[PDB]
């Protein structure tokens, strides 16, 4: 357990939620993982370090950094905590333009289709596929198990390509039953 450090830059639009949730972020990092936590206000980057005399799990530092990173991407705290709890969760990230070059109102409607009315469609994918989805403008992040994120990705991509939400919803029930 050698002295190591990680730096995770916080984008400005995630600083204020980081403030309100800081009380629930440093306890698990400093207690379970035995990590030395700090935020450099000058650089606005969360700094994590291994304490050689106290830290014991070699994977604590990287485990903590991914947890901070998950919150940074826009995932709620409790969902990010799942990265600390478990060891088999990964984040899939891809853009709308990667699937299809959509611009103007076509891009706006594609984002609206993925989220659905009142976010119903996004929750439908999240529940069926056992994953969490953050829809940041045209940037989509999916969190979950490796086999699970791929299933959610396919359901999302079908929506981008133009498949109506209703048909995608039925497909979610089928895979959900298989799960």
């Amino acid at each position: 357990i050698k002295f190591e450090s990680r730096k995770i830059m916080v984008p400005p639009h995630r600083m204020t939620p980081l403030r309100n949730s800081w009380t629930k972020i440093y306890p698990p990092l400093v207690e379970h993982l035995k990590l030395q936590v700090r935020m450099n206000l000058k650089t606005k980057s969360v700094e994590l370090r291994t304490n050689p005399k106290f830290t014991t799990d070699p994977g604590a530092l990287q485990k903590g950094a991914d947890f901070i990173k998950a919150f940074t991407l826009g995932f709620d705290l409790d969902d990010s905590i799942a990265l600390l709890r478990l060891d088999d969760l990964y984040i899939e990230t891809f853009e709308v333009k990667d699937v299809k070059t959509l611009t103007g109102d076509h891009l706006s409607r594609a984002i609206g289709r993925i989220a659905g009315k009142d976010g119903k469609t996004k929750f439908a994918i999240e529940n069926a596929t056992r994953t969490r989805i953050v829809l940041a403008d045209s940037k989509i992040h999916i969190l979950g198990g490796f086999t699970h994120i791929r299933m959610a990705r396919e359901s999302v991509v079908s929506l981008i390509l133009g498949s109506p939400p209703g048909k995608v919803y039925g497909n979610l029930r089928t895979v959900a039953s298989r799960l």
Binding site: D79, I81, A82, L89, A124, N127, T131, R132
Partner: peptide
């Protein structure tokens, strides 16, 4: 299938 935000947190479902 539920169309609302799941009360259980992702760690809990797993």
């Amino acid at each position: 299938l539920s169309d609302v935000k799941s009360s259980k947190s992702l760690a809990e479902i797993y």
